[PDB]
Design a protein around this ligand. Structure first.
Ligand SMILES: O=C(O)[C@@](O)(COP(=O)(O)O)[C@H](O)[C@H](O)COP(=O)(O)O
Ligand SMILES: O=C(O)[C@@](O)(COP(=O)(O)O)[C@H](O)[C@H](O)COP(=O)(O)O
Ligand SMILES: [Mg+2]
Ligand SMILES: [Mg+2]
Ligand SMILES: [Mg+2]
Lengths: 455, 455, 160
């Protein structure tokens, strides 16, 4: 069935749709399946399955329904580009507070349309939210601004937060776990659970937070500096998440504002992110995206990109989200991913297709992690352009030849080397922990800094 | 770094791992990326990133950690097959009730490993859960038995539940919405919100619930038969979901056990499914999987299959889940998808790689939907083998030439034709509504029943 | 919840799983927390199921939380010794709905990975259906052990 006459109107101007403030815009890279309709016909059915229609005509459709149709307003078959405008009245709102829910945005814009039989693949690369809809999202209530204040840093451009993940990913019992935290905090600022750490039978939850809380006090008394920890409170059950958060804040007591909450937002879902965002709005929400690569990978032509994921996370209320190492780490990523960081940190930024005004919505910190170490940091900061962020290096810290404490300092000195604009090799001659990272990761040192042993 | 000696033990026998009952087994179709390690090396790193390790050695690892390593126990590079055994001590448990959470299972078995830069793609096709771990999942609390009992049907093999989705997907105001519910209920059993219908400004939630409630009373008074409705309560906020469900049950009063709750479990996440499962255990939980096609599609070689998704849904507590039309509808699907239905309905069933014993865990109803109508139904039931299920036809019902009421009866008569083993064309000679479905969908009638006009 | 769910924990067939060997901790009252747990350990060496005697709860000589923690420890010791799963049914009866919740919530949390080994005993006759429903609707996935103390006042054939 050809529904292009109804669900496609290419005469609409994107600039007039934006100025109207009545439409969410989505840009897709789509390819029709062979043996069905052409590009515009497929894009039309795509819009029908994403708003008001199905695959056949129904007697219950009226002129009002047609008024809220999602409309294909731009196509470019040569580049497989498809843009669709969704009237904002389509998106579901809370009965309790009239606010928006990202779950409805996902259901319409990238839900059933991912299973259509007449489409080979379709992936969202960008979207635009107008003010009337943008302001209905929670946004972040805590930012890096609040971590800086705890660390004693300036609340404007407070700078780099040295971080790590406790490794092994799983296996450490409570006290060995806390001993590693104490070691790293002797030279570092931030520690977080590895995404799956929680209440394993060999490392009970409450036993572990108590041991970490003791380590934090010991590290703070020893170094005279404040230390931060991010606990994983992900769970299927809403009330399990609350129980973990409430116990943590109470146990850490006067160090409760040193605590962040980690959520595996992708596999647990927006509901888990919103649970932590609204239950603990004054606790830095640490968005972990394990599993995102199933759709975000460039190898995938379905779902949505990491850019789309990061932009959505800011609406959900993530204080910080993993944005990837941008090609400098062990995970898939590219240097152009720095545009993701600007989109979630700035009040105004450009996506691959749409410019976004955030209207003073709080920024989401870009959390850098994934095979990072002191040797890989200078090049990363060169690509991004700033270091007002959190970086966690698990293997990069506890894989240091001289231990986690030395690993912590190697990250500190690496960012100081970039801030000073110094040559890493020459800078290492006066910074032992940074120099020892070359011996800790000789393969990386050989590729990044040829002939480093000779200097 | 080569980690095959630690994270690979191909001398392990799958039959002993199963008999031991101490390991979750996962089968993946994996392909290493060019320019890195061979197959066993990639599979070993894959297992490390999915349990206890990272991409480098760390000083904190002890023997206890090594004991809980996930182990590659079987490979077949020719077919890109990789099997991994996850010790069940790795998976997180609730502090409040010590039960399992699917979020932990997803984070480890299909989380970070989807973003590994040394892997081109990896997709889970099957998994095995031993008794010690299986019995810790919620499982369904409400089944089709309870819908049959409300309909007055036998609680064993109660038969086919004629259903539909209110179309248009969006745009109907409260009372027009309810009028369409009444029309279909005159010949059908089951009606559900379309996945995005909820609290749109043009169709307020409470006004729609009240109008549908009145429609149910009018239809039951008119037909003398019980009627069912499945309301979408999906939301980011746990408390929004409770608010919608509590209001529905109070409004419907003595028809409260006629209510099912629909959840967009894929975009909202397991947390949303669990909210409905645990807050409303005695309300049929209707799992909707909008967005799943981004990973489950055979066009995708990442994430997991629809079989994996359905099996998890049964553990999560879904009373029913969409299993696709198995190639007979408008969405992607194949005839072999009937194995998904058997896996969620039987106490013992075979997956593509692992046999599963469910130990009496309640079944999940296979909900058939997606471009279905009376003409396509006989073929679908021949491939499945039974009709003890829910089938919803939005366009197939309200697209009927004579309206939703006649469309409802066409679906009823379509299954009666299959139960009687009659020829559709000949059966239509004595069943008006079914015959008029040929006129409603002539393109389908021409392909499925050549020369139907002459008879 | 049904005996099916106790059979599953014990490793029995979920249909016709067979006989569950059980006892009540005697004395009915008087045992202090650790002697109470020591009796639980002894029986579990040969049995499956243990329940509070109907009035056992939070007596001054046997505080509730201390007894729950000691019984929880005994269950691990007996399961680690025998290699078999063990079950316990705690009395959570109380006039105050929120007392019943407090008790049940603390038990499940304390037993942790053995939480599915726990049943909840309710003196349904003297406490009433309201107490039964509290346990039924607050803890649907915990075996509800209905104790009928006091029923003999009306059910006895001597009564008309
Ligand atoms: O498990 C891991 O691999 C990490 O803890 C990094 O460990 P290392 O520091 O040892 O590399 C992070 O979870 C990933 O970086 C997530 O990827 P991303 O940030 O791209 O979402
Ligand atoms: O929006 C729709 O398209 C449907 O209401 C079907 O409508 P029609 O009956 O009118 O076609 C269902 O939500 C999809 O079938 C879900 O797909 P699946 O079950 O494959 O996950
Ligand atoms: Mg990690
Ligand atoms: Mg639908
Ligand atoms: Mg007694």
């Amino acid at each position: 069935m050809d529904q292009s006459n109804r669900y496609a109107n290419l005469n609409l101007k994107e600039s007039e749709l934006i100025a109207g403030g009545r439409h969410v815009l989505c840009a897709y890279i789509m390819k029709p399946k062979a043996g069905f309709g052409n590009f515009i016909q497929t894009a039309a059915h795509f819009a029908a399955e994403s708003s008001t229609g199905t695959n056949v005509e129904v007697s219950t459709t009226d002129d009002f329904t047609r008024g809220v149709d999602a409309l294909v307003y731009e196509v470019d078959e040569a580049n497989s580009l498809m843009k669709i405008a969704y009237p904002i009245e389509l998106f579901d709102r809370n009965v309790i507070d009239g606010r928006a829910m990202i779950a409805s945005f996902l259901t319409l814009t990238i839900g059933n349309n991912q299973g259509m039989g007449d489409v080979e693949y379709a992936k969202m690369y960008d979207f635009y939210v107008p003010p009337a809809y943008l302001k209905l999202f929670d946004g972040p209530s805590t930012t890096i601004k609040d971590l800086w204040r705890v660390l004693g840093r300036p609340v404007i451009n407070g700078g780099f937060i040295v971080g790590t993940i406790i490794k092994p990913k799983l296996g450490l019992r409570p006290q060995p776990f806390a001993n590693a935290c104490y070691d790293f905090w002797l030279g570092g600022d931030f520690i977080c659970n590895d995404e799956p750490q929680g209440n394993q039978v060999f490392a009970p939850f409450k036993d572990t937070v108590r041991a970490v809380a003791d380590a934090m006090r010991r590290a703070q008394d020893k170094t005279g500096e404040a230390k931060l920890f991010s606990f994983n409170i992900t769970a299927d059950d809403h009330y399990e998440m609350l129980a973990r958060g409430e116990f943590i804040l109470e146990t850490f007591a006067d160090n409760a504002d040193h605590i962040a909450f980690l959520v595996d937002g992708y596999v647990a879902g927006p509901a888990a992110v919103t649970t932590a965002r609204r239950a603990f709005p004054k606790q830095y929400l640490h968005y972990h995206r394990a599993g995102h690569g199933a759709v975000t990978s460039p190898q995938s032509k379905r779902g949505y990109t990491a850019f789309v994921l990061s932009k959505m996370a800011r609406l959900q209320g993530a204080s910080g989200i993993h944005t990837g190492t941008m090609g400098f780490g062990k995970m898939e990523g590219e240097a152009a991913d720095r545009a993701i960081a600007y989109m979630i940190t700035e009040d105004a930024a450009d996506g691959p297709y749409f410019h976004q005004e955030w209207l003073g919505m709080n920024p989401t910190t870009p959390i850098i992690s994934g095979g990072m170490n002191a040797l890989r940091m200078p090049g990363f900061f060169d690509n991004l352009g700033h270091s007002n962020l959190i970086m966690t290096a698990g293997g990069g810290a506890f894989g240091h030849v001289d231990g986690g404490a030395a690993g912590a300092k190697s990250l500190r000195q690496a960012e100081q080397c970039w801030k000073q604009g110094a040559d890493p090799v020459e800078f290492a001659k006066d910074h032992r922990e940074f120099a020892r990272a070359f011996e800790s990761f000789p393969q990386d040192a050989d590729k990044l800094y040829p002939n480093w042993r000779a200097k």
